[PDB]
Structures are given as C-alpha cells and as structure tokens.
C-alpha cells in the first residue's frame, strides 16, 4: 500500500534534540518517524515542537546517539497519541503506550491524542462521590472527593508515595481505575511500585506509565499526559472492570517536579529563553493544562470522573518555590507531609494545620462528615 | 523589458562558459596559487568573483555556479532534484524510462540514482520533500509489525 | 488582507502578510481550521516586513506553516448588549454555555477601549451602598472602586458575591459581571452557575442577572490575559 | 502468581522471537527471488502514484 | 542556485549601472552611433546590451532595460517606494510623467500615488526618507508668518 | 574519517569531517597530537555539514586548529572480563599501574550502554553490616541496591568510605570496583591503594579483587565526566 510522506532531513541532531530541516506541511505536534536505517532495526520517533522558517526542533523520543545528521525523518500525519482502553490494565507502559512489563502486546482499539483541551467549562459537575484513601487523617480532615485534584507536597523522604501507593490499593472495590504516571522515578523504585501493587492484588485495575530517569526528557516530558489521556478515556467511555463499565479513573502523577525539570531540560535544549529558575515562561500553562483535565463531567456527558494526585517534592521545605507555588495554585487541595512530624512517630506526617482541602466536607460520606 | 531579457541571458550563458571554462584554472589553488591560475576568460567582476572564491581555495563546484547561471536566467526552480533508490543497480534503458516517467512535476528532474542494496526489490523516489516508497523492506516492516 | 504563518513555537504564532495590508498591533488573526471552527489570534508585534507576531488564544497542535490567516482589521469583538445577560462566554465572546449563539444583530464592540478621560472622572469619592453591614461599616466600598477579598473556600465569598449582585440588581439596576480569570474549571464553573442559578430574588435568579466571562487556567495565557478585557467591554 | 505471569511472559517472548524468525526468513527469501528474477519488474510499479 | 547570487548579482548591477550611465550619453544612436557614443571598456553583455538597443532604436528604453538588470539576479524588491501625493487626481500620462521624472532616483522604482484632497496644487515627493513638500506647505508657512 | 579541527574552545573541539563519513553521537575520534600518542575525544553533538563537536578529554592545551582528526568508529571501548582484576585504569581503560597494557584478546566493551531493563531490576535487598552504630542503625546499608553519603567540604566522607571500605572489603563474597571521580590523589587513591594491598584474604589481597578507574580532580572535565561510565562498563 505506497503512500506519499513529508521528508525532512536531520541537518543538526543534538542532547535529544534534533533540526529536522525541510518538512513543510507538518502538524505543530507531529510524530516524526527516523524510519530504520543500516545500524537500527527499529523507529526512534519524535515531536516536532518548534516549527520554525526552514527548520523543525524536534525533541526525540528515545535514544538520539543512533540518529544520524542527513537521516531523512517522514512525518506521520498523528499528532502524538496514546493507545487507550481496557486492554491498558495491569500493565506497565511507556508515556508511548508501549509495553516495559514484556507481558506482551497492549491490546487495543482507540488512540487517544494526548495534550487535549480542558473536558469543558459548563460540562463539569460539583464533586459529591468520595474517594476513599483509607488514611483516617486524609478522610477526615482532608477529604478527596472524585474529580478533585489533590496535590500531595512534601520534602524528599516523608511518605509522598506511600501516600499515592495506598490510596491506590484501598481503591478494590470503589469502581476506580488507578493510573500511576512514573516521572523520572528510577526504575528500581517502579519496579518495586509494580511489586506493591501486584503483592495487594492492586494490578488489576491500574495502569502504570513510567519514563524513568534514564529515558530521554522527551518522554518524561509526554509522561503525565499520556496516563491523563487514558484517564480521560476511561471517564468518557468507561472500562469493564469486576464486571462493571467503570468510568472513575484515579491518576497520581509521580513528581510533577521531576516533569517540570524534564520540560525545562527539553526547552533549553529547543534554546527557548527562559524564565524564573531556569524554568520556561508558561510552566504554570504546563501544569494547568495536564490538571484541568480532571473533572467531574455531568451526567449529560457521561457522569464520569477522573482524580488527579500530583506529587511534588520540596527542597528544605520550601513551598515558596516556583514549581511548588505554581502546583499549589493549580490545584482544589494540599496535603502537606512534613520530615518534622515524620520523625515524631505521625506516619502519615499530614501537616493537618496547613493541608486544606478547598472542596471540604462535599467530599465526604454524610457519616464521615457528620 | 525586451532588451534587458536578452542582455541578462547573454550575461548568464557569458558567466556559466566563464565558469565551466575557468573553473578549475583557479581550483584549488589558494590566493597567491591561483593568481597566476585565474586567466583572462571571465569578465573582471567574473575575475574578481573567481579569485573570491580561490582565495579560500573552494573553487570545486564552480561548474555547479556555471549550472547555477543559466537558471537565474529563468530563475531557476527547475532543479526539482528527486532522488531514486532501487535494490539492483539500475540499466540505463530502465533508468531513462524511469527518469522520462516522472514527468509529472518538472520531466527529467536531477536525479541521483542510488542502490543502497539493504533494500529488496522496489523504488524510493524522494521528489523535492515528498518520498514514495514502495520498496519491499518497507512492505516487510508493515508485515513485521505483527511482532 | 490574507497572510501565511511563518513559525509556530508554543502559543506564539508568526505570520507574514502583505506589504501594505499588515494588521495592527492588537487585531485578530483567526486563524481557520479545516473542522469548520477558527482559531483567533491576537496580534502583539509589528515586525520586519509585513510579519506579525501574535498569541494564539488557543492550542495550535494542528497548524501547518503554511496556513492562510484572515486579518479582520479590528481587535478582538465581543457581543455587548442586553442579549449577552445571563450567559456565558469566553474571551473571544463566542458563547460556552449550552444556549445558542448570540445573534448578528447584536452589537459588537473592540476589547481595547480607551479608560475614561480625566475631566469625566468624579472629583470627590462615593460610599457604594451593598447593605451588608460589616462591609458598609468596617471597608466601605468606593463607588467605580477597587475591593479584594483575601480568603479561601467554604468561607462564603461566592454566597458574598451572590448578595452583592443581588442588593445591587434590587436597590439599583445593578447589572453584574463575573469575570473569571485563571480560575479552577471546578470552582469556577459548576459550583459558580449552579449556586447562581439556585440563588433567588424577586422570583429571578441571580445568574439572569449577571455576565459571566470565563478565562480559566486550561486556556493559552493569551485567553486569561483578555478575559478581563472582554469582561470589561461588556 | 508470579510463575504464571513469567510463564505468560515467555511465551509472549517466543512468540515475537518466532515472528522475528519468520521475518528474517521472509527477508532471505525475498532477497533471493529478487537476485534470481531481479528488481526491473518493480520498476512498472514506479507509476503507482507518482 | 545559492552560488549565483555573488557573481551573477555583481555582475547585473554592473550592467545596469553602466547602462544608466551611458543613459544620458548614448540617446537616440544606432550601432554604430552608440559604439563610438557607449564606452566598449564595460562587460561583453553590457556593450552588446548597449548597441543593440540603440540599433534596433529602442535606446530610450535602454535605460529601463538597466532598470531589469538587477532584477535579473536579485529579488528585485530594494525598488524605492516613491509615494506621489497630489490634490488632483492623476491620469495614466501623468503617472508616466511622474515615473518617468522620478527614475532619477534609483530607477523606476516601486511608487504609490495618493489624493489627500487637502492639499492645494503641487505634489508631494516621499522617495526613501527624503520629502519634498510643495503644495500646502506655503500657506501654513504663510499662516506662520501672520501668526 | 580524517576530518581537521577547526575551533578549539576549552576541552570541547569542533570538528569538520566528510559529508558521509560524519562519526556518530557518541563515538570517539582522536588527534595523533605527534609524539607516538594520541587524544582521545569523544563526539557530543552534531552541528551541521560535517561539523562535529567533542569534548577532549584530555589536557588540549597544545594543538592547533586544523589538525587532522580520525574517527575510529566506535564509542570509547573499555577492557572488561578477569584481566582487569587488580589493576587501575584511566577513563580511557588504558591501565596506569607499572604493569603492563591489557592484552587484544580482551574483550573490550562500549562506555556507553543501555541500563537494565524494567523487567531485569531485582527489588530483592536484605541489610549489609557495616560496622557503623549509626549506618547500621538509622540507616542501613543496602546490600544489592543504591546507598550514598552527602557530605560538605569539612565533614569525614573520606572517612566514612575508607572505613566501609575497610570493614566490608575482607568478606567480599565476590569482586569490586571503585572509581575516583574528581577526588584527591592524595588520600582518595594511593593510599587506598596502600590499604587494599595491605589487607589480606587467604593469602589473596583485597586489591586483587578489585578494579579500580581513576579520572581524578587533576584530569580534565572530560575524564570526570567519562569515569563513571567507564568503571560501571567494568
Ligand atoms: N506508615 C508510613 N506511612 C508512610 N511512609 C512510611 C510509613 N512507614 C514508613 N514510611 C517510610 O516511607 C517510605 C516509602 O517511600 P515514600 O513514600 O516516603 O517516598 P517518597 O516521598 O516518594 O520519596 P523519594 O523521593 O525518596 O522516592 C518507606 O521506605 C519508609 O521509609
Ligand atoms: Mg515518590
């Protein structure tokens, strides 16, 4: 089946970053192809971000020391997209959708575009169902109700993912699809995440897309919003799960620190000027994107939800930070875990003081509020 | 107009017989070496460009300067470069065929017909920006895709 | 009056346009999309020769460098009038509530408009009457003045807000607008309209009352940055 | 439950070593028709499209 | 096509400068009149461009010609925007007696004409960034006077 | 190959190679530099025609622009396997001890390789005694996974290490590697040296169980950047 493809070719491929010269008629988010050449057996895609006169800065989705300047690179007509759907559950995928876990292929139908508009303004509803942590200090003082983004702050040690991971299992039988996004975590630590989930029984109803530290900052960069798409399919079309068509997704974003650096990383390699810290100027546009995708759509549009977890680490407890103000600002709610009150014995380490939950007792069951 | 046509393709066919002629008599040699090389064929805003060119020593692709002063007289956008890529290395009669077949876009573009014998048994034409591939490596990928 | 985009980095978008048809420092590009829908842009930079740096308003994941775009000589227009009462917009005005479209004949006016001069201004300061009596009391407002409120949620501001658009719609005419700028989609839509829409007044609601423009943090910061603008001019 | 998913796990692996296999085969084969008929029959196919 | 702009580009502006030069000079000739009246120490193109004109006895426009040569090898687009504003609106032959006056600066370089009905007689001459004034500007300079 | 310098910027050189012979991302090329021994530099980015840029290595305080530069094709190739027991390494693998270079027939490997895959990590640790009250005690090390102190300038990180060096080094129940980034000649090596071959396991040193790469605070950014990676191939 011949077809026609735009041809450009890498004049200047660099740290994950490449100059993809004449490929006129791109799409501004295209997957450029690096079909395999004599050397590679397989295809290092690629995200046309900048697109420039007579020039493509693409970041590269892979390993960049196999391109090669002069390799011809054909953009594939899709803007980047992630397979979703019910085959997704229990495995282990890269932000590309591709299986880590080697259980075999991803089974699917439907790829949905990641970087998607907001679910929609009046297309929401208020949060009234409860998502149930099973931490008594976050169900009481801090409740989370579904599609209600709750940050999780804290220094580097203090139960961040602890915190995620349990409420993760306690989601059995509450008709919801867990989704842990893995951003630049090391692969020991996903590794010993999935053996968590799996030792608990956790694994049948959870999704995990990982771009460890490793992988280029390009797919840590796509990470939260691949696992955000198919959490929004999950709300808009619903999975099989336990016999019920499940349309409660539950997406923990794994440090949306480590993504901030990651998008930093790919912008100053793309030479974009930057901002405060380093960060480029619409970072705050970065995470406001991926966190007003979770929603509470009314039951006109389906009644489906989706909760986000994001987790940032600060350093020296400093929630005056960029990133830390940004995420803060951004999100309905903080639970602020402190290495003070870690040490003291209080496991959980929930500053109830400061940790506020904006949506309140609407988030709670009439007994857990009463 | 009329006059400024004709004198402007006289001037173009002068500078690209300069060229072709006086290319490689200043090749090569650098600044002081070719000064003696750069000969009395070519206009002295010809000479002058020449010995530019010269001083530096990258007076190779000259003729590709002649070849490119015909075309502004037209100016140009006839290249249309495409480039054919075929596992057998090609016959002359199936290279003209093929050279006189993609007549769709210019006729007889610059084609630089290459092997690259890793494929089996088809064609990559890349005209301009657009590649057509049929080539059976590419068919052997969209089955391999089962894995 | 037709240019073709030259870059696309982000929310940025560079076009070139004619000689001496290049658009002015704050109109609309709007772009056109295949889908049948447009893609607005806001002119910020007059440049080089005949190019025009512009904020897109939007996502632009899907443009070419190559694509026509359509100056329509004047700035962002948005719909004023008693018809955009009680509905919501956005910052280009294009109604996002689940009504119809606002009809042609409506007016439409420029989102920059020049602050009132000098002389117009009132040379002593007012009390606005809202009838609460801790704010008529402790912080009176100013009539055509500025007043922040500094709290966070389940404190009642927006049951504050829904009387003061209420006293000033009863005592007064007191037509109200809302403008929400980076705004959480789930405070500020939702838990705004239906609060609104509950709420009550000589057998009218609140929200056939008020304006709502919405610019929330999911949009470009263009969006957020004219949402004000466009509430302004209505 | 971990020797199933690792039984689970091996066979998807030699089922993409086998189709891997089949490909590379396919690949010699291909290789050697075009050697014995050549590629010149291809050539007709350069009209297709362009 | 990238290498023609140097030399092909020098080499058209010397032709259209020399053309413009012998303009004055070389009006009205022949071959031979314009052989012994243009300088043969120019370009082989240029003195060919020079004589044939003149024997063909389109040297008036030879000097136009020159106005293409440049644009022969160059994007043609540096061309002086000589606005024309005039009270009265113009006819064809008054526009042609306007370029025609006005190739004195560069050539017959890119002029828009407008009406600005408030000015009294005379025109207004915008060539580069240099005005000339001479339609208003003596009864406002009166008018200061007075004042 | 034989491509020639061109710019000369600190321990980064700029290099112009053929059209198609340009080396890869991380392959390492070499100026002969005269004398019978060459500079090693490794390639970093690919800048355009031919034009690549390469971090040095090395001292590149003596060459020239437009010295000829050859590329070999490969990355940096360490020698791996029980030949490189005992002995200490450069960045390069190029041994500096008194003995003598690592024979052909020793199988060199990239610098530059693939880390484990998501399915190879072994998550199983159980507590390695150390001999510390405090390690053992608030912080255990790990026995098969990642540990590391995070000292200032003034505090004892050099002692803590030559203690667990020395308390943990005698039962090894297998081999180890250590490698000298950017630490002091002084105490970080050779004297680790003269510790490890005076302790003694059954008539085998614990310096015969050991490969040790250098690439110390004398050596240039190049060798501390490339140390790590060369001793983690070993
Ligand atoms: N009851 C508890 N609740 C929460 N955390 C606990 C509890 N008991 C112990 N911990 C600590 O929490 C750790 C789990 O990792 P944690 O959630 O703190 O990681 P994190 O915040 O993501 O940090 P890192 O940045 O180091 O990965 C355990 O290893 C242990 O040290
Ligand atoms: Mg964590």
Redo the contacts with the bound molecule.
């Keep these: 089946q011949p077809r026609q493809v735009n041809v450009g070719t890498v004049i200047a491929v660099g740290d994950g970053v490449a100059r993809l010269s004449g490929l006129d008629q791109v799409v501004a988010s295209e997957i450029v192809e690096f079909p395999p050449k004599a050397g590679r057996n397989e295809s290092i895609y690629g995200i046309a971000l900048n697109l420039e006169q007579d020039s493509v800065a693409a970041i590269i989705l892979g390993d960049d020391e196999t391109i090669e300047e002069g390799d011809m690179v054909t953009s594939t007509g899709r803007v980047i997209s992630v397979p979703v759907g019910q085959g997704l559950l229990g495995r282990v995928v890269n932000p590309l959708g591709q299986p880590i876990d080697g259980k075999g292929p991803i089974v699917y139908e439907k790829t949905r575009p990641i970087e998607r508009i907001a679910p929609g303004v009046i297309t929401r509803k208020s949060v009234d169902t409860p998502v149930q942590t099973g931490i008594i200090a976050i169900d009481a003082l801090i409740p989370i109700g579904r599609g209600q983004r709750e940050l999780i702050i804290?220094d580097?040690?203090?139960?961040?993912?602890?915190?995620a991971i349990d409420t993760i299992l306690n989601q059995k039988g509450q008709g919801m699809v867990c989704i842990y996004v893995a951003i630049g975590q090391r692969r020991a630590?996903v590794a010993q995440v999935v053996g968590t989930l799996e030792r608990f029984g956790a694994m049948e109803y959870t999704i995990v897309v990982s771009a460890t530290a490793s992988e280029s900052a390009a797919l840590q960069y796509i990470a939260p919003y691949a696992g955000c798409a198919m959490g929004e399919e999950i709300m808009e079309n619903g999975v099989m799960l336990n016999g019920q068509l499940v349309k409660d997704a539950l997406i923990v974003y794994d440090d949306l620190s480590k993504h901030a650096v990651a998008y930093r990383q790919v912008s100053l390699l793309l030479r974009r000027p930057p901002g405060r810290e380093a960060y480029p100027g619409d970072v705050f546009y970065l995470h406001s994107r991926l966190l007003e995708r979770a929603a509470r759509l009314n039951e006109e549009y389906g009644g489906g939800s989706l909760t986000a977890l994001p987790?940032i680490?600060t350093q020296a407890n400093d929630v005056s930070a960029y990133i830390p103000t940004n995420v803060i600002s951004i999100t309905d709610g903080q639970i602020y875990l402190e290495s003070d009150l870690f040490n003291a014995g209080q496991?959980?380490?929930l500053n109830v003081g400061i940790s506020v939950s904006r949506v309140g007792g609407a988030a709670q069951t009439r007994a857990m509020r009463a | 107009r009329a006059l400024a046509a004709p004198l402007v393709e006289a001037l173009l066919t002068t500078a690209a017989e300069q060229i072709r002629a006086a290319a490689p008599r200043i090749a090569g040699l650098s600044a002081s070496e070719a000064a003696a090389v750069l000969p009395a064929d070519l206009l002295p805003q010809v000479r002058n460009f020449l010995l530019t060119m010269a001083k530096e020593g990258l007076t190779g692709e000259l003729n590709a300067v002649a070849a490119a002063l015909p075309g502004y007289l037209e100016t140009g956008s006839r290249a249309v470069d495409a480039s054919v890529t075929s596992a057998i290395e090609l016959s002359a009669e199936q290279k003209e065929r093929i050279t006189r077949e993609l007549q769709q876009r210019y006729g007889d573009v610059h084609v630089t017909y290459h092997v690259d014998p890793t494929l089996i048994g088809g064609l990559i034409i890349r005209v301009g920006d657009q590649v057509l591939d049929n080539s059976l490596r590419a068919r052997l990928s969209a089955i391999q895709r089962v894995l | 009056a037709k240019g073709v985009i030259q870059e696309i980095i982000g929310v940025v978008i560079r076009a070139k346009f004619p000689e001496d048809e290049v658009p002015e420092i704050y109109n609309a590009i709007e772009i056109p999309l295949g889908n049948g829908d447009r893609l607005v842009c806001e002119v910020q930079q007059q440049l080089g020769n005949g190019v025009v740096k512009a904020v897109a308003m939007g996502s632009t994941d899907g443009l070419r460098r190559g694509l026509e775009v359509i100056d329509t000589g004047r700035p962002i227009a948005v719909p004023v009038g008693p018809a955009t009462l009680g509905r919501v917009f956005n910052v280009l005005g294009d109604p996002i509530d689940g009504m119809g479209p606002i009809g042609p004949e409506v007016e439409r006016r420029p989102i920059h408009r020049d602050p009132p001069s000098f002389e117009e201004q009132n040379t002593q300061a007012q009390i606005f009457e809202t009838g609460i009596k801790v704010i008529d009391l402790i912080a009176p407002f100013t009539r055509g003045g500025k007043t922040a409120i500094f709290g966070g949620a389940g404190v009642g501001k927006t049951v504050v807000i829904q009387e003061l658009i209420a006293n000033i719609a009863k005592e007064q005419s007191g037509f109200s607008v809302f403008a929400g700028v980076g705004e959480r989609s789930r405070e500020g839509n939702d838990l705004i309209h239906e609060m609104k829409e509950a709420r009550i007044d000589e057998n009218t609601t609140v929200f056939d009352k008020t304006v709502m423009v919405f610019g929330q943090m999911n949009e470009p910061p263009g969006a957020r940055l004219r949402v004000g603008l466009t509430a302004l001019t209505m | 439950a971990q020797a199933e998913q690792e039984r689970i796990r091996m066979l998807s692996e030699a089922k993409s070593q086998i189709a891997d296999l089949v490909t590379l085969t396919a690949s010699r084969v291909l290789g050697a028709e075009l050697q014995a008929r050549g590629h010149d029959a291809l050539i007709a196919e350069s009209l297709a499209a362009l």
């Design positions: 804290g580097r040690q203090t139960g961040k993912t602890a915190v630590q987790v680490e496991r959980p380490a």
